[PDB]
Structure 1
Amino acid sequence: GMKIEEGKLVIWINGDKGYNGLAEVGKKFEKDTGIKVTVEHPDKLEEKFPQVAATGDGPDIIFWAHDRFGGYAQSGLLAEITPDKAFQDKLYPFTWDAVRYNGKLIAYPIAVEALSLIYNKDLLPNPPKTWEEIPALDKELKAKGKSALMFNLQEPYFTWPLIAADGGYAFKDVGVDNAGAKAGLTFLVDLIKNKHMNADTDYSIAEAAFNKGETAMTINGPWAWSNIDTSKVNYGVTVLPTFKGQPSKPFVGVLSAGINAASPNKELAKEFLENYLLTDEGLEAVNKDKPLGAVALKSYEEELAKDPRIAATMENAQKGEIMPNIPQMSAFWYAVRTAVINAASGRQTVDEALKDAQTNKQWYDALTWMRENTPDGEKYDEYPFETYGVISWWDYGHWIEAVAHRMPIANPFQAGIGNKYNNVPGASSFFTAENESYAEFVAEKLNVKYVVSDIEMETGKYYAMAVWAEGDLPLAEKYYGGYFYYSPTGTFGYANSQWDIPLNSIIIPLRIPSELYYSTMEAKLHLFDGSGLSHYRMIYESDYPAEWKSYSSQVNLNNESQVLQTALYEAVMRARYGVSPTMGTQEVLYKYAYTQLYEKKMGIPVKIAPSGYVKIFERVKGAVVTGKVSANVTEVSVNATIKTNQNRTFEYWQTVEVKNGTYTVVLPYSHNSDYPVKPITPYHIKAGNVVKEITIYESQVQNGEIIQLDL
């Protein structure tokens, strides 16, 4: 006979939830009513729902974290639910707040999720009730080869519960730079300054430290429990510590069930949810498949609560903050993530970090509003003639694009900046290129023939290039190491971390680059003068930075000892006022640091000496020299002395692997170019005890011609 259209309830839930258990509840409903219930778990259902809600594929009921439902309700996709007072009284009242758009309920709460304090009972049978207790506890444990506490410091989801504690921050606003946030962030950074925690501690490091028994406590959620069980750590889960007497405030996620505005069976959906799912029997079926954690239903929660871990989840959740809807949470996350990381790393003071977090949040909130309140929403989200422009100062264009999803008139991205994370050729991806092959990819795409670098690009501005290349402030931190200092006993030293520096030291306020920096194109070009590169040659350099032009009148710039002595002298002189060295001195210290820390591994020679403020290089095919290797060796080296137009000399080196009896080296300098920077020695090509000297014509370099030369 005829087909049927209102005969079924279609339910969508994510694949990581107990859908088989939910289907058992569906089977009971079907047995009782004859209405068949189909539980589906489509991939990306939370993205598909707004598209298909009104179609034949649309589900009658959708299960998801409450923080998507605001958006759904905003588009009119969810029916107002109508539970009576008796039914509302069956759930914890705070859970209903997660699904109320005021007055109106738009979903049924099912379960709640929040962070707890997790502790090792064998190291710490009585966990601390306050954050204030943690440093003394760490002192005790450090004596025994352990630490008190390790958790993910990289993500505001994990750090905000402490930062929000004082004043009990709630989302709309006070806002994020309020005095309570300053107190909490200050306490957090103090734990780092005093070595109770480490600023680079992330999720994986904290989880490994805890599950291998190295730290007494961690902060994490129910998703982390499985790995702990596997580790056989004797662990407990409990209420988060208070700060200044006030509860830590973790974000709360409430898994919720909304009813499709377009469903022709809203009353049956209500019946399924209220009288089948939200019962002890119903929640148990789902929970037995995959654990719901703490549930919104009081009667069942009181059964689950005999697992102390679940009791702890609910207690922290009742003390926490319902997570704001995704777009608000995102604006908050963007702003605060950088603040904590900058404060924790010493890039900024707590005050200035939270100050910028707040102003950044103003911008992110404004752009989020623009995204939801100006036309052509869905055409911009897939990110032509019928577009419009948003005009603002050029400093803001990338935010306008990334946050508002609108087209800025003044746009950083398309000013030839490019990036590394998406492989878009541009200045940032060229200068931070981690090998020449990558640099050549970028250069060829852009038809680069000349490179101009100054000492600012080498030093202070490199940071900006890395931020753009990585598309993120924190990600740029991997380009940097620690600090030079003089101890109170006069001993010169290097520390990976400022906090490892002895008290009363004189610290040179110049962050030294990490190994990664020295391998990038900007370093290869400006710091190493192009040494090692096959496709670039220097053709001109300007005069020295003025301070070094001046020093040269009383120091020999070719004596590394005198140069270093002079550099350290200036650095200390300025360091007493907390001022960084002059640019040329920064370069000298970068070179010195390389020779002390990284040269043994990387093997490129560099003289500790200053150099031209501005350097021009030409990009060339390079002359190819290749031949058989008769000597019993695995490498071939080529070197030449280059002299610039300032009469400074440096060494060009390149070393290649012998590949089955042959070598191939690509050389960018010629010996008859009309440029004022030129090699003043032939190339010296060495394979063991075999040494051969060669000079190259400019036509060979320009046309990439091949030279046969056996060794």
Structure 2
Amino acid sequence: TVTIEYFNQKKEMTKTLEEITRDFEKENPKIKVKVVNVPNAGEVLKTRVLAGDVPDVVNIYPQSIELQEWAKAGVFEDLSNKDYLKRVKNGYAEKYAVNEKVYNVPFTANAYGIYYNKDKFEELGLKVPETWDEFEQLVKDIVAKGQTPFGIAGADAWTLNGYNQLAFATATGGGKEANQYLRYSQPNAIKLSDPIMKDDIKVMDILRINGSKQKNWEGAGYTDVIGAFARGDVLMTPNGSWAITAINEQKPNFKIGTFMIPGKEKGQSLTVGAGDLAWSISATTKHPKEANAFVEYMTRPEVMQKYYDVDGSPTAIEGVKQAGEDSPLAGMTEYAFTDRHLVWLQQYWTSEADFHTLTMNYVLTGDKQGMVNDLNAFFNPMK
């Protein structure tokens, strides 16, 4: 009577997760599933995979450069041909393929965008923008109506990771494009007078209209910026869809909305993000058939639905009933799991930290050339 391991990385869902684990078992009396929640679970897993003590089912983040390397070594089962994969939106899992196969079932994913105060927007007669020029005017117009366009956490450069990645993606037409310009170009090819660069500069200057941000944003942090937002201290703030929960808790006094960053024209906005509840399988598990049994469980609607009514992140499984056109994340996720919902660019980076910093530095100083330099310094050791 067999027993298998799900090395879970999603620590905050572990209740509803074991909850599920049981009622899968409640009806598979010939399978055990023990649910691993070790601290330092990132480095635990790396050591083991490499030590060849690989878990039966892994919650592994598919943008990871573990997964690229592990898959292209032979650690995971090829799931391209599974039928429960039919159940993912669009081509969606294919966006993490290795050598044209799929090795991970992305059940849910984050996204990134601009949160905004609707009541505000209503009373001030203000429209969600749909082009860089409109965004820029929206910020000017708010400053003029005597309020604060942005909450910006000057001390958490990562809060603007998405914003800048979306700047390059909208300016170049998508992830593949953005990474061509940035990462797969020759060394020192990023140049201040590139049309793209000028565009990117432009998206970033929206963050430095005069008056755009809240007092002392310079040294503000995430949890701070959440507050300003829920208070009304500002009308907007760039961030992931993870924020919504935190934001809900200052019990804000108005209805929250979100919009996707626009590109240069209508119909051209874009959002970024990756798999969050996402699964792969050892190519070397004992009882393979059992693992596969359990993934296809999770892919069932009534199962997902049960995870979703609690987690609330956009889910790429069909026949789950998701929050509707006026949930707070409705705009931010209006094209999730399609091609206008890019995988995080750094999926093909050796790191990101330098990027979050060249990003805030620029918001902080305005130094255009500095950022171009910052950028090749960041990417150049890409040989």
Which TM-score band applies after superposition, normalised by the shorter structure? Answer: 0.7 to 0.9
Residue pair 1:24, 1:285 contacting (<8 A) in 2 also: no
Amino acid at match of 1:132: D
Q: Distance in 2 between matches of 1:169 and 1:55?
A: 38
Q: What corresponds to 2:294 in structure 1?
A: 272
- How far off its partner does 1:10 sit? 1.2
Cα pair distance change 1:90/1:212, threshold 3 Å: same
Q: What corresponds to 1:50 in structure 2?
A: 46
Within the candidate set 31, 35, 39, 1:39 is matched to 35
Q: Note if 1:11 corresponds to 2:6.
A: yes
Q: Distance in 1 between matches of 2:207 and 2:56?
A: 50
Residue pair 1:160, 1:250 contacting (<8 A) in 2 also: no
TM (norm. structure 1) is 0.45
Q: What CA RMSD, in Å, does the superposition of the two structures yield over aligned residues?
A: 3.0
Q: Distance in 2 between matches of 1:293 and 1:74?
A: 29
- 1:43-100 Cα offsets, whole Å, 9 max, x none, are 222221233348896421011321222233244322222434x543321124213431
Q: Distance in 1 between matches of 2:42 and 2:70?
A: 10
- How far off its partner does 1:201 sit? 6.8
Q: What corresponds to 1:214 in structure 2?
A: 233
Q: What corresponds to 1:282 in structure 2?
A: 303
Q: Distance in 2 between matches of 1:337 and 1:220?
A: 13
Gaps of 5+ in 1: 367-711
Residue pair 1:248, 1:320 contacting (<8 A) in 2 also: no
Q: What corresponds to 1:89 in structure 2?
A: 86
Cα pair distance change 1:305/1:181, threshold 3 Å: farther
- 1:206-252 Cα offsets, whole Å, 9 max, x none, are 32321210211122223211232222231333331313116444431
- How far off its partner does 1:295 sit? 0.5
Q: Note if 1:192 corresponds to 2:208.
A: yes
- How far off its partner does 1:152 sit? 4.4
Q: What corresponds to 1:357 in structure 2?
A: 375
Amino acid at match of 2:302: E
Q: Distance in 2 between matches of 1:130 and 1:306?
A: 21
Identical positions, percent:
19
Q: Distance in 2 between matches of 1:347 and 1:25?
A: 50
Q: Distance in 2 between matches of 1:217 and 1:59?
A: 42
Q: What corresponds to 1:112 in structure 2?
A: 109
Secondary structure class of the residue paired with 2:18: helix
- How far off its partner does 1:118 sit? 1.2
Q: What corresponds to 2:261 in structure 1?
A: 241
Amino acid at match of 1:128: P
Q: Distance in 2 between matches of 1:8 and 1:324?
A: 38
Cα pair distance change 1:168/1:82, threshold 3 Å: closer
Within the candidate set 342, 353, 358, 1:321 is matched to 342
Q: Distance in 2 between matches of 1:74 and 1:82?
A: 15
Q: Give the structure with the larger strand fraction.
A: 1
Q: Distance in 2 between matches of 1:298 and 1:115?
A: 22
Q: What corresponds to 1:21 in structure 2?
A: 16
- 1:379-432 Cα offsets, whole Å, 9 max, x none, are xxxxxxxxxxxxxxxxxxxxxxxxxxxxxxxxxxxxxxxxxxxxxxxxxxxxxx
- How far off its partner does 1:354 sit? 2.0
Residue pair 2:77, 2:281 contacting (<8 A) in 1 also: yes
Residue pair 1:134, 1:148 contacting (<8 A) in 2 also: no
- How far off its partner does 1:108 sit? 0.9
Q: Distance in 2 between matches of 1:133 and 1:347?
A: 21
Within the candidate set 281, 285, 293, 1:263 is matched to 285
Q: Distance in 1 between matches of 2:101 and 2:140?
A: 52
- How far off its partner does 1:356 sit? 4.2
Amino acid at match of 2:253: V
- 1:532-570 Cα offsets, whole Å, 9 max, x none, are xxxxxxxxxxxxxxxxxxxxxxxxxxxxxxxxxxxxxxx
Secondary structure class of the residue paired with 2:180: coil
Residue pair 1:11, 1:37 contacting (<8 A) in 2 also: yes
Q: What corresponds to 1:173 in structure 2?
A: 180
Aligned length: 353
- How far off its partner does 1:329 sit? 3.4
Q: What corresponds to 1:148 in structure 2?
A: 149
Q: Distance in 2 between matches of 1:222 and 1:295?
A: 13
Residue pair 2:258, 2:329 contacting (<8 A) in 1 also: no
Secondary structure class of the residue paired with 2:305: helix
Gaps of 5+ in 2: 184-189
Cα pair distance change 1:312/1:185, threshold 3 Å: same
Residue pair 2:148, 2:211 contacting (<8 A) in 1 also: no
- How far off its partner does 1:190 sit? 5.5
Q: Note if 1:61 corresponds to 2:38.
A: no
Q: Distance in 2 between matches of 1:325 and 1:193?
A: 28
- 1:177-199 Cα offsets, whole Å, 9 max, x none, are 35324312234226515333478
TM (norm. structure 2) is 0.80
Secondary structure class of the residue paired with 2:175: coil
Secondary structure class of the residue paired with 2:55: coil
Secondary structure class of the residue paired with 2:182: coil
Q: What corresponds to 1:225 in structure 2?
A: 244
Q: Distance in 1 between matches of 2:247 and 2:34?
A: 35
Residue pair 1:12, 1:59 contacting (<8 A) in 2 also: yes
Q: Distance in 2 between matches of 1:193 and 1:304?
A: 34
- 1:665-689 Cα offsets, whole Å, 9 max, x none, are xxxxxxxxxxxxxxxxxxxxxxxxx
1:522-601 matched pairs, under 5 angstroms: none
Secondary structure class of the residue paired with 2:108: strand
Q: What corresponds to 2:166 in structure 1?
A: 161
Within the candidate set 77, 80, 104, 2:78 is matched to 80
Secondary structure class of the residue paired with 2:77: coil
Residue pair 1:294, 1:311 contacting (<8 A) in 2 also: no
Cα pair distance change 1:262/1:254, threshold 3 Å: same
Q: Which has the higher contact order (CA 8 A, sep 6+)?
A: 2
- How far off its partner does 1:124 sit? 0.7
Secondary structure class of the residue paired with 2:33: strand
Secondary structure class of the residue paired with 1:27: helix
Residue pair 1:50, 1:72 contacting (<8 A) in 2 also: no
Amino acid at match of 1:166: A
Secondary structure class of the residue paired with 1:237: strand
Q: Distance in 2 between matches of 1:20 and 1:316?
A: 30
Cα pair distance change 1:223/1:253, threshold 3 Å: same
